[PDB]
Amino acid sequence: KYFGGFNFSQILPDPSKPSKRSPIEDLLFNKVT
Amino acid sequence: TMSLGAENSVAYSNNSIAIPTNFTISVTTEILPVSMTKTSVDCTMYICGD
């Protein structure tokens, strides 16, 4: 995941979770009820 | 389980470019409504029939 130098780790789906979402999406599914 | 299509793995790299060689002119269609049936009802005959 060396995409030129930009870190897309917060928007790409994290594999270490059962929902296969991104860290930013995790905040969205927890904030909105 | 619903499938979202076949899986594709675009080979990304620092020195990999995909320039197309041929072209395919395609003609699609789109059906958009522009107007509906202009209706008009009579209050007297509908409510009070004869």
Swiss-Prot record, chain A:
Residues that carry a glycan: N7
Residues flagged as site, Cleavage: R21, S22
Job description of the protein: Precursor of the fusion protein processed in the biosynthesis of the S protein and the formation of virus particle. Mediates fusion of the virion and cellular membranes by functioning as a class I viral fusion protein. Contains two viral fusion peptides that are unmasked after cleavage. The S2/S2' cleavage occurs during virus entry at the cell membrane by host TMPRSS2 or during endocytosis by host CSTL.
UniProt-recorded name of the protein: Spike protein S2
Primary gene name: S
